[PDB]
């Protein structure tokens, strides 16, 4: 048993607040924002030993990251940013920091009731996206 077991499973988007705003703060273009904002992504989270995999499937884009907690990795995001990423587990919350071009954004995932709640922060903007088991 792993702490990340709380996160393992297939998760579907059920609500979103301020995602367009968050995407604007990152400099995401209009067409990507419109189509991605519309989409209904699922996330499959799996653990295999020390390696955690987060795989996104949608009609917009499919993406995958695999990582070990605390070990920096190069990530190319869905909006084509080339970032240095580090993901850690802090007091039960998966905390993902991305660094690029002297900027930073933090993505936090936490379990709340039967939900997986994603809090995205860029500069002053917080977006909350809520996911439930598929
Ligand atoms: C385009 C996109 C983005 C980019 C815009 C902001 C930075 C990258 N970030 C996402 N999440 C929430 C994280 C990684 C920030 C998601 C996403 N939403 N749920 N899972 N992934 C999506 C998304 C993918 C496919 C279908 C719809 C939306
Ligand atoms: Cl997620």
Author numbering: -2 to 131
Q: What did the original publication write about this model?
A:
Tetrazoles were among the most promising almost isosteric replacements for the fatty-acid carboxylate group. Their calculated pKa values are about 3.8, in the same range as those for fatty acids.
